[PDB]
Design a protein around this ligand. Structure first.
Ligand SMILES: O=C(O)[C@H]1O[C@H](O[C@@H]2[C@H](O)[C@@H](O)[C@@H](O)O[C@@H]2C(=O)O)[C@H](O)[C@@H](O)[C@H]1O
Length: 404
């Protein structure tokens, strides 16, 4: 007679399918009740951090890979799933994906899917602009002027939120210099002061060349989710550098007949590595002190492995890593090669991508610092030179506290 709580984040489409899956789970186990706790991405980590600090987190959580150092530096912040391998079929998940979710030999999460940020474009707006999708960084930067002149000041090749930008310029810097962004031995960023000048100078170039809204223009709209903004819905902001695993949260709010379409991935001649931010998209974890680890395990197995859970959940989290699950969704015709999300992943996997991203590159205080920094620049409060030093200094401090 078992009462479980489960949290997750995502759009309403993801909420809808998860809710149907939990109703089927309860149908399958009338002795097991699941209270569902769901929101969008915004504030979700923050609410979870409060819960975990008071020992009141859910039995089952959808978790983010970059949270592992936050909650489980020593692998003990989430229940070890090696202890519930009897309810939960672990062999369906590739051992090297499961290694991305293991900390000090403890299995902290089951990776649901993998993802990298790639370029998707509004095919309607790009058609009107008369432009081909950029194949090079130089083309991306040259696209802004064409949009601006051809279609109007309100038209932009892409919109980039600060976290997207952080990833994008890093990918460019990885292509050029082929070094990790974070030096983990020394608990600090690897870039020289000059490469940080180059990083923020690139931002300023793209903003001046009309590639994307400045953070000041972006702020003139409202506090909405980006995919919920008018200039996104009406095609004026004509693309996104986005996780393939959540691309329908974006393309579903376009004005028909507009679609998001996979763009090419810009690669500097002579680059040894595309500098993708490629990671597990999300995990399902069990609370450290859950009073029901076995029922929590059963629920995660249902959702990720069972015919019924897998069918219900569809692709609202990306392309399943579970071998049974992904085979199932291909056989039911739900996974189609031409779908932007599946095509996005295939293209990414073919890109040279040996460099892995440190979970510290996505530390929420580092991401928040980045947005502060480009806002310094856009609102004229710091020069590029000053912003680059500021970011390097304040960032190395955060890293030290984060990697503590
Ligand atoms: O919901 C997802 O599928 C993703 O959520 C997380 O990303 C955040 C937002 O949900 C997403 O719209 C994007 O803008 O980036 C945000 C972020 O990266 O923190 C995960 O980080 C993704 O891997 C994915 O699970």
């Amino acid at each position: 007679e078992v009462n479980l709580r489960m949290s997750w984040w995502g759009g309403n489409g993801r909420h809808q399918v998860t809710l149907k899956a939990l109703e089927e789970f309860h149908k399958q186990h009338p002795n097991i009740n699941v209270k569902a706790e769901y929101t969008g991405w915004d504030g979700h980590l923050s609410r979870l951090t409060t819960q975990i600090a008071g020992g009141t987190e859910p039995d089952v959580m959808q978790t983010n890979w970059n949270w592992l150092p936050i909650f489980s530096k020593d692998g003990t912040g989430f229940y070890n799933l090696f202890s519930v391998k009897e309810q939960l079929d672990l062999a369906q998940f590739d051992p090297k994906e499961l290694q991305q979710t293991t900390v000090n030999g403890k299995l902290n999460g089951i990776p649901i899917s993998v993802t990298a940020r790639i370029f998707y474009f509004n095919d309607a707006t790009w058609a009107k602009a008369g432009l081909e999708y950029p194949k090079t960084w130089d083309e991306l930067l040259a696209a802004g002027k064409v949009f601006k002149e051809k279609l109007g000041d309100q038209y932009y090749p892409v919109v980039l939120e600060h976290q997207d930008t952080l990833a994008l310029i890093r990918s460019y810097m990885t292509q050029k210099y082929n070094i990790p962004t974070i030096d983990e031995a020394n608990k600090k960023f690897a870039y020289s002061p000059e490469q940080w000048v180059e990083f923020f100078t690139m931002y300023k170039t793209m903003v001046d060349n009309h590639v994307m809204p400045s953070t000041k223009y972006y702020a003139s709209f409202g506090k909405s989710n980006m995919y919920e903004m008018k200039p996104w819905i009406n095609g004026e902001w004509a693309g996104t550098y986005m996780w393939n695993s959540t691309i329908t949260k974006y393309s579903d709010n376009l004005t028909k007949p507009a679609k998001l379409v996979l763009g090419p991935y810009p690669m500097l001649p002579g680059a040894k590595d595309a500098g993708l931010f490629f990671k597990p998209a999300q995990m399902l974890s069990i609370g450290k002190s859950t009073k029901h680890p076995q029922e929590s395990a059963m629920l995660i197995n249902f959702l990720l492995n069972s015919k019924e859970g897998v069918e219900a959940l569809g692709l609202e989290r990306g392309v399943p890593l579970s071998a049974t699950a992904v085979t199932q969704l291909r056989a039911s015709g739900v996974i189609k090669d031409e779908d932007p999300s599946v095509a996005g992943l295939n293209m990414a996997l073919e890109l040279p991508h040996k460099m892995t991203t440190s979970p510290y590159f996505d530390d929420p205080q580092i991401v928040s610092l980045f947005g502060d920094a480009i806002q310094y620049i856009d609102y004229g409060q710091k020069t590029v030179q000053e912003t680059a030093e500021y970011f390097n200094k304040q960032g190395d401090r955060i890293l030290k506290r984060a990697m503590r």
